[PDB]
Design a protein around this ligand. Sequence first.
Ligand SMILES: [Zn+2]
Lengths: 204, 71, 116, 52, 115, 165, 85, 134, 141, 69, 206
Amino acid sequence: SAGFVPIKQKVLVLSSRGVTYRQRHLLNDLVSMMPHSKKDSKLDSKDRLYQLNELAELYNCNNIFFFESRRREDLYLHIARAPNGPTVKFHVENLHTMDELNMTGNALKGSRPILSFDKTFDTAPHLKVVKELLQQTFGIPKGARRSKPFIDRVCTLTIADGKIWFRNYEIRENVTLIEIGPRFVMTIINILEGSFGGPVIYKN
Amino acid sequence: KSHTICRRCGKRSFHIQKSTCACCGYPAAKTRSYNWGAKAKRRRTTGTGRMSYLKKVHRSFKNGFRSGKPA
Amino acid sequence: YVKTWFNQPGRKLRRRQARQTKAAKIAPRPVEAIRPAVKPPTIRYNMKVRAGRGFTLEELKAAGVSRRVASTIGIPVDHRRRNRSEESLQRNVERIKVYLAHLIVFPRKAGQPKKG
Amino acid sequence: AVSEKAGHQTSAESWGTGRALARIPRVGGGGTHRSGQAAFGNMCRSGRMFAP
Amino acid sequence: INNTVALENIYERIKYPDDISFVENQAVTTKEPIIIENVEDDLARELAFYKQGVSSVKAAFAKLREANVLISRPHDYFAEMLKSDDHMEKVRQELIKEATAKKLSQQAKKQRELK
Amino acid sequence: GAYKYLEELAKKKQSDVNLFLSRVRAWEYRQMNVIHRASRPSRPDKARRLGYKAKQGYVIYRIRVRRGRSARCTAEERVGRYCSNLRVLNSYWVNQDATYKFFEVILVDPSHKAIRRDPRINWIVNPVHKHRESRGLTSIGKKSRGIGKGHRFLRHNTLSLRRYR
Amino acid sequence: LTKRQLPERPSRRKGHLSKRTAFVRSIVREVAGFAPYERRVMELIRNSQDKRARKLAKKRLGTLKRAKGKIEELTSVIQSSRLAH
Amino acid sequence: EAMTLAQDIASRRKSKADLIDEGYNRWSFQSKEGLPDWFLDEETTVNKPNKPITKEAVLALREKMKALNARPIKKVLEAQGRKKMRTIKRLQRPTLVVAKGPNKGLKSRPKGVKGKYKMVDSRMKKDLRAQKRL
Amino acid sequence: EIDAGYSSDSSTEDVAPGLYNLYINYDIDGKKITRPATPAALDSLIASIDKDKGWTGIVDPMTGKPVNLTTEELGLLKRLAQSEIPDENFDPYPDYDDFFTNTVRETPLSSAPEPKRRFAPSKHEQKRILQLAYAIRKGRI
Amino acid sequence: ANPRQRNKQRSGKPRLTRRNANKKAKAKIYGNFVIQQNWDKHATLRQNYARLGLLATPNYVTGGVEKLY
Amino acid sequence: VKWPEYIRLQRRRKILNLRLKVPPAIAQFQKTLDKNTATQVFKLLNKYRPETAAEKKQRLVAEAEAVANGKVSKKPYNVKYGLNHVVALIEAKKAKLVLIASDVDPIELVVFLPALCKKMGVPYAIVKNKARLGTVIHQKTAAVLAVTEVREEDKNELASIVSAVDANFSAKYDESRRKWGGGIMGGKTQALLAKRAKAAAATVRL
RNA sequence: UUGACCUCAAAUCAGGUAGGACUACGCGCUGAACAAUAAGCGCAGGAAAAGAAAAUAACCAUGAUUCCCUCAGUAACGGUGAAGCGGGAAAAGCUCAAAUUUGAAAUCUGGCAACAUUUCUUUUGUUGUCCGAGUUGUAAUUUCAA
RNA sequence: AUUGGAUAUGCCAUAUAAAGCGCUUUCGAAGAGUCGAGUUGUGCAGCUCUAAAUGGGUGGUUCAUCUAA
Ligand SMILES: [Zn+2]
């Protein structure tokens, strides 16, 4: 059929050829972070990205994640709504992995987090759309497989000089939060009105 | 005795039990050569003998390896 | 491992002899072929003009030379290079056309049987 | 220049400490006038010159 | 080009209903618009981020308290975690070395005055 | 020409025809020796395009090498040693099973007059082509050592001191 | 400068499908038969399990475009056979 | 090999539907129905696909192969005892020389010296005192 | 849209049993699942002393009891381990399917025009005839 | 120095000496007869080509040419 | 009895090709043209043998003498041979009758020819041995022969041979060539295999 | 019965060829302790290897390989460490597979026989003839620059 | 003496031949257990799976360039 036990949100994750060791570290850290994401092999075409809708329909995932490495020194992340929907391209800088010595946060894999967005996400329209889209993606829907029922971590999204800061924290009993480890500086580049297509509706 | 005369290199290094010379490696077809033995090579290399044919080739090259008889 | 240049004078004279040995073989003709004029591929160097490898198949055809006799009279051919602008084409056509006007081509000996 | 392998061609190692002889390497083997003679040194006869 | 009308239409089309319970969404928007002007001073922004997270955690806990959802994780929970247990041993060793370095520095400082 | 049909027929290596023949020939090649003479190539299409002409002086030798260095490179080196009076021109893949990979090696006799008088294979009679397989100069030997044009594929540690420095 | 439009080089003509190569490939495709995974894929397409067929072909070949080309090739075999069967 | 496969079906790690699809390969279509013994015997010896092997199946097979009387009271006590007593029977189973007079300028083991030994020449005393001061 | 559902055969699913501590701890919504009582020592000894057919020795996380493959599962394992078609009724030997050659092509495959070689006396023979003519007049033949 | 080299140092057979080491000799001209007659062996090829009215290279020269006057 | 290794290989390959399941494209070569029609085929083919190497040189030197003294002919008619030449003739739709050898050693050289011949509309037949075809063309072997043109005398003869091949090879078999070949077993082989199969299926499943 | 072919053997069968040495430079493989290193193994030449773009670049574009200078201790990677451009040395381009010669296997090795030829009675061919190789494909033609 | 590439000249030449350029109301084949995907080792190799035909490779912001086995 179209779907058995339809979970509200599912994610599809891909990586392009020529990704770096740290970039592959971040991608592996993410797929562990959201358990409702289906990993997929490399995409051979760094240019014909519009096929991702067909991949999304195949795997029944409505949220597309693509980690494109350019020149083996730039990291970009395309996040889109699989059926029609917006497509937002981000640029990644100042990466941080799980294996870093400084970051000692420890969370349960699949535990449903709490999303805390900076109020600046409600100022501009494109920021409103991005906040809502990121909410529907990072927020693990109820009944997701391999997910944990307990609440243990909080993911924080903040806007600083037009740059999104994403920080995950582990709540300790008493908040006394501890940085989990995923720390990277985000940069919105452009937004497409369609799934990897359509006219550009926002430009940096 | 533990060594006898090797027929190939004429040295009393042919092991009786293993039937193998310790100097050249007889009866192996290839001679025993080891680059860590730099002095070992210069003791038995080319030129340490008559070198009768090589001297003939060296002498015959200048005229173009010709044959026949003069006028 | 240290590389030394004590044979730098020895190398310079050996090449001058090699040029002299070429001229002994082929005396009425230059010891170098005629290279075209091209513009280097960068924003730093595109103002300059240096010598390329050979004349494109369109530069030969426009000048009047065919790609078969070009090598015979000493004109190198570059099948890879192409003419993206009329400036490069007209520049190298005149380089060949000057060459053809300054060239003396000695006739060969043609075999011809008794009948046709 | 001197030969790069001049003075290195012998097979000498220090005879050890505590034998009432200078610890300069001495050529091993036996049965010749050379065995027991010190080598591998600027001060030694038939030894490498200092800073070739 | 930054079409607010188009963005608003897309936002309305993909808007999550407000009637959705906080349990289903688990997304909290801070009422206080926390602003960190000192972008260069990351230490100052860290306190602001912690305060925003603490406020969000308190709001979520109060909202989820009426939902009868176990916020606390029992000590008997031994499921698979995001951070590998093998990696935790290396993390503990690194923290132990850093703690020992601070202890040695304090001991040396006390020894300097003692001598 | 039939060589087009053979080329496109050898592309589908698990179809009904190509799977039936693969097993039948694999058992047959196992009955014979590890390195045995092949009277004619089993793939006339592939040998043809690798340099083989059906004239005197061209030799085909079939060899199987255990799976689990490149197997093709091993095939040429073992055959070239076995037939030491010939030159290893090229080689190709013919069959395989769970234990063995079967190859056919095209060799050329450099003392044959049909080879020494052929202007298109004269190049192999010169002594610089002695044991191309041994020096990594064959098609698979070139690949195994990264020889190629592009970015994918002693000047470093030497100190070059000029006269006037 | 005055831009010149250039002709097409013969090396850029490569990839063009010929009438004889199309005929040869279709003749050989029928004669040879189908690979074990192709036989399974055609069963799934006949049983209308299109989603399972595409996932299988992508798993076998290793790329979605290769899978999409193979599924189109095999489904054209199915319809052409069903027209003649 | 079968145990690694049997573990995968039961443990649900590998989906049953995917296992069935993975069973349509180059080797399953090489049918063995009716072939002669002289052909099959070499085919199994040679043309046998080598599937991957997991340590868990190795342990499980060892558990199956563990007979009821594999390790009874005697084979766990006297068999342990014979090894222990064997090991017990296996278990029960420097001189200062001064470089002077005839000992001066030696290169190997000197006369009338056996076992571990050390050589002293009274010149290393200066180095010894310096080392002590270090 | 696509409903963001789950197919019945998706490679990701709940419950990942492992080699036979008991993982009877919790469930969804954070409620403690009752731990099933340990089986009778007599029954456990019987199972340990006599392995059931297809004894995998794998325990699901929910219950401490082992999981054993059923008759059909043993049948599929037998087919898979012996390398045969895992479907009992699926003809691996279908009839010949002439989906392309069942219709006759009315035109020649190539469109290249005929050369004049084929309508005039051959040049290779004429070349050899001239060569043989030269040999005759020179007395060689 | 070598055992091969000391072999002929002590040998009585004279060395295979060939006296071909005449530097500063510029190759004589075959090919064209007219060039050979008007070519003088002291001058370089660049000086001979210029004197005869020919071009040694149709390209630029990668150095400073000579200036005698 | 101890057979040599190559004799054992020969006979095992004969039996192995029988017990296995031969694909329809390879099993159609097991069913060749009948003995009577093959005789009539080769009667026509032996009126169009290519002229011998001696007979060709004999003709050429005859014309060479004429020009050597002082000095227009007809198009030669014969049988067409050579795999690439014949395949090119079939695709050109010029061949009137294609005769495929039944034992070409790498079988895929001719495995597509029955399909290619049926695709292009060419009457074809599979005849016994590569040596009979070779004998016609003065060779040791011909993987395939073909007839494109015959003299007006033999136009009626070829039309009879083509009809006989159509009636005795194409109208016949036909469904028999669409079936997988092989699996043939001896008189006592199934009984022995049935005992082996039931014994194996009992408890020898490991 | 007689004979075609396929495969496989045999011969102190006719004529050939391989091995070992040297190993400075060259090309592969293998490889440590402290370095695409030493040692070990395989294989050549007077040079070897590389080589006529599945190459760069983002320009007004360049145009096989090799080497030199430079780029440059630069970018990148985290101390290591390039390459494109640029200046120069030398320059040279090409051969196949995939096409029906089909109005003609036009191709080739060997034997025998004459005839020449020679660094040479020592070398190298030619012409004739016969047996063979070859249609499961040897020549001419074409190689994308077309 | 022994040779090299030219020049002059004699004899022979199988030209019913061969080629360049230019024109097209006619055609134009292009290398597979290879590329690639997955994984394990040190671009390369093993293992498992295994292709395409304006296709495929490599770059860059649709474009450029190239045409492997
Ligand atoms: Zn010896």
